[PDB]
Ligand binder design. Structure first.
Ligand SMILES: [Zn+2]
Lengths: 131, 87
């Protein structure tokens, strides 16, 4: 499953200077095409490992890093998801999460970047409960 | 360090030390300690936006420990709440 190794695949999508503004709506924000370009064909030990590398790459892309505060850029540099705004939090979940559009439990690609999006905790919980 | 129970027990310098401790935990492997520090920050500042002051600073002020302390001081004073220890 998500705990097994694999190669990242996918093209991602172009994004503007408001990349995560819609992270709390619908299926959230797409993996940026530039980020996809850096992770494509690389192998990861787990989805958690892909997640860390994902955030590290975001911190290295000047066009994306500029969309986050200094404290949020430091978190991403070590592979942790940026903190969401207070209003998008859900209990102890206070950081952006990655969502698989098509669940692993049904041929859903664990490392397919075109099957992965960034969502706020609050939106993520809603997505899985049918909202 | 020592977590005091009110903004009034903190001088501005001591509050900046708490902010740098939070910056250190931002880069730790996990958020276990960071999150206790953030709950403390939110509890004593009492600002409705909580952690947004640290992670989502307004463009009209500096994104720095000095800018966070200044905004806190202005918001507390504007709401007639006790400010930082003047000594
Ligand atoms: Zn999900």
């Amino acid at each position: 499953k998500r705990n097994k190794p694999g190669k990242a695949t996918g093209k991602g999508k172009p994004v503007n200077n408001k990349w995560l503004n819609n992270a709390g709506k619908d299926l959230g924000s797409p993996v940026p095409d530039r980020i996809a370009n850096k992770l494509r064909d690389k192998e990861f030990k787990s989805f958690d490992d892909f997640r860390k590398k994902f955030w590290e790459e975001v911190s290295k892309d000047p066009e994306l890093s500029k969309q986050f505060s200094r404290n949020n850029n430091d978190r991403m540099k070590v592979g942790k998801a940026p903190k969401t705004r207070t209003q998008d939090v859900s209990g102890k979940r206070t950081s952006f999460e990655l969502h698989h559009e098509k669940p692993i439990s049904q041929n859903g690609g664990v490392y397919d970047m075109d099957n992965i999006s960034v969502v706020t905790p609050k939106r993520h919980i809603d997505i899985h409960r049918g909202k | 360090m020592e977590l005091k129970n009110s903004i009034s027990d903190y001088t501005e310098a001591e509050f900046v030390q708490l902010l740098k401790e939070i910056e250190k935990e931002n880069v730790a492997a996990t958020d276990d300690v960071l999150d206790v520090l953030l709950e403390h920050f939110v509890k004593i500042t009492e600002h409705p936006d909580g952690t947004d002051l640290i992670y989502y600073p307004s463009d009209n002020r500096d994104d720095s420990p000095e800018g966070i302390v200044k905004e806190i001081k202005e918001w507390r004073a504007a709401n007639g709440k006790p400010g930082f220890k003047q000594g």
